[PDB]
Structure 1
């Protein structure tokens, strides 16, 4: 049987604002490569023969971005199907559109468009097919989690996930998040329904690579109230003797898998990509065959592109990526940072935990900590940036203007905190 996949290239939450008002979240680059390219490379290395990409907002930009990629070439083994509609606004709308179109056949993957992973899930699909052949198509969804300590900066407090499963047969019995909960409540019918074994798990980072049966689309066609994934599992687990459908689980300990929904998830996943945690998917390997993204791997995870033209006194110590044509001045100090292609850096600067995208221009004397600079940006001299600052789509910051900790400045007034100019004061 072939391997189908559904890719949700539009996560419908209002989190990357107003970064998403310029370019959708799946087109934002971690290290000069968009997230949909990472997801398509993960799907092609998985063994998926056909994908179904779904795009709602700014969909023409996504289409013209991925049409010139590696996966829509005729030499691609993984064929894609670009499906767009201005009507759907949720993941359940996507899955009921799949059920109305009848695209998949059996045992299809379901994934978002901003999932970073390198898991080969053939063992999980073997277990899912064996359970479907044994229980006569009773088990429906096989969720995939990664073992992780809860103190890790990857899993933030917005989507820390605690489950209650079986350790014998790996079926999911309870699922909840920790969105503002000090004491967690668990039901009691899971112990009476399974007296052979039960375990609670807080060590599971959610990768959102839930491989499914087409009964997921059936239940999404029936239940119109199921808006997204955790709605579906929270409605499926509390109703067991009606619409039985026991969800099973797979745990990965030797491969990486995550997604992004914050600046924190973006920064942690980017720091894991630069520190090669998602090997083989590394920026110097150039899994997307493009001459403007190939790099060379030096010591201490220093990735250098072509024609960089470093200056005297500029030191790169740890986890630095330099794109194509980014010029760097003298006496610089860059660490733990990703620099885009075609940038301009001044003199006597520090850049730690920062994400500079393409086309930016940094003047001399600028001190940037833990920030994010989007495309075509600019900053003058005598500026020092604080942690968790967002600069978005050519915002100019004038001299003698230090930003606070909470700082998001964009061209849109009400979505950001302010709108800047040649002078930062109004």
Structure 2
């Protein structure tokens, strides 16, 4: 199955902007490893064979890294190309543009920013595929991760209320969790054709979406759409798009999350020091480092000299040639 993925880099570039002036956001190190590599490893796991990276801020340095990267080699699982367009792209703008090129072939993966995950999207695809095989008006299935409502990795954006048909796993209601919004307002018509629904405030909205080839054209149409959740999903539900259905894949294992905020960057990074996203762990040395795991979650590369009477405590990662 020829699969492709679209990575919207440069998206949350403004949040980290004392940084992202020298480097770009996707080249920022999480745990001594550039964020873009986590995304690539995840897509490679998903079985993606074609990657397009929308970027602008330092798009030269980005394209350079990708050129000199692990993924430009003959062994690389996919083929990564880059797209340079005018900065501050919305998700809709990239998708509308994506349509003008007829780049999209079949079903594809749409992620914004950088994704740190070890969820095998293989089964999510076959689910999405066979669902389209029977009915082609199913255009997107959203990968979300089970959690608890107050969960630490569940932030402002990930905090959303979903209502899913318990048997068809079709999303019949979505609403982001804003303050001052004290209610969940559903249109009573849903209840006479979906009848065991599940209201869920425990999900982590990873915004890892598996979209169909219709979606770019559906963004050329309805040219007012900017955010993949705020406008598009709302549109399908409130029927701006008339006959479209979207689904949820609530993953119950592994890890998914996106590096969007400065605080999420902190959150995910220590979720990485903990072995939550294995094998994507410092001591796996994917970029040929020399890390080693020790008790109380301390990670040390080689050639690191420690003074005596020095106290390195738990959850600490030390790069090579570092002296204390």
Same fold flag (TM > 0.5): yes
The residue aligned with 1:403 is none
Q: CA deviation at 1:12?
A: 4.8
The residue aligned with 2:299 is 303
- C-alpha separation between the residues in 2 aligned to 1:156 and 1:98? 29
User: What are the equivalent positions in structure 2 for 1:26-425 lying under 5 Å apart?
Assistant: 26-86=26-86, 89-135=89-135, 137-181=136-180, 183-230=182-229, 231-239=231-239, 242-288=241-287, 290=288, 293-328=289-324
The residue aligned with 2:6 is 6
Decide whether the 8 Å contact of 1:140 with 1:216 is kept in 2.
yes
Shift of the 88–96 alpha-carbon distance from structure 1 to 2, 3 Å rule, reads: farther
Q: CA deviation at 1:15?
A: 2.2
- C-alpha separation between the residues in 2 aligned to 1:124 and 1:45? 12
Shift of the 12–279 alpha-carbon distance from structure 1 to 2, 3 Å rule, reads: closer
Shift of the 228–37 alpha-carbon distance from structure 1 to 2, 3 Å rule, reads: same
- Between 57-66 and 154-163, report the one with greater CA deviation: 154-163
- C-alpha separation between the residues in 2 aligned to 1:190 and 1:84? 44
1:89-117 CA-to-partner distances (Å, cap 9, x unmatched) read 21111111211111121111111241111
Q: CA deviation at 1:190?
A: 5.0
- C-alpha separation between the residues in 2 aligned to 1:10 and 1:129? 30
Decide whether the 8 Å contact of 2:55 with 2:87 is kept in 1.
no
Structure 1: which 5+ runs fail to align? 329-426
1:167-216 CA-to-partner distances (Å, cap 9, x unmatched) read 11010111111132351332224533524221111111011210110111
After superposition, the CA RMSD in angstroms is 1.8
1:229-251 CA-to-partner distances (Å, cap 9, x unmatched) read 112111111117x5311001101
- C-alpha separation between the residues in 2 aligned to 1:154 and 1:67? 33
Decide whether the 8 Å contact of 1:161 with 1:178 is kept in 2.
yes
Q: CA deviation at 1:279?
A: 0.5
- What is the SS of the residue equivalent to 2:103? coil
- What is the SS of the residue equivalent to 2:148? coil
- Between 125-134 and 186-195, report the one with greater CA deviation: 186-195
Q: CA deviation at 1:16?
A: 2.2
Structure 2: which 5+ runs fail to align? none
Decide whether the 8 Å contact of 2:32 with 2:319 is kept in 1.
yes
Q: CA deviation at 1:256?
A: 0.3
- C-alpha separation between the residues in 2 aligned to 1:37 and 1:13? 17
Larger radius of gyration: 1
Give the alignment's TM-score, normalised by structure 1.
Answer: 0.72
Q: CA deviation at 1:252?
A: 0.8
Q: CA deviation at 1:141?
A: 0.1
- C-alpha separation between the residues in 1 aligned to 2:20 and 2:180? 29
Q: CA deviation at 1:74?
A: 2.4
1:2-34 CA-to-partner distances (Å, cap 9, x unmatched) read 011111112157422333333322221110111
- C-alpha separation between the residues in 2 aligned to 1:86 and 1:157? 28
- What is the SS of the residue equivalent to 1:109? strand
Decide whether the 8 Å contact of 1:110 with 1:209 is kept in 2.
yes
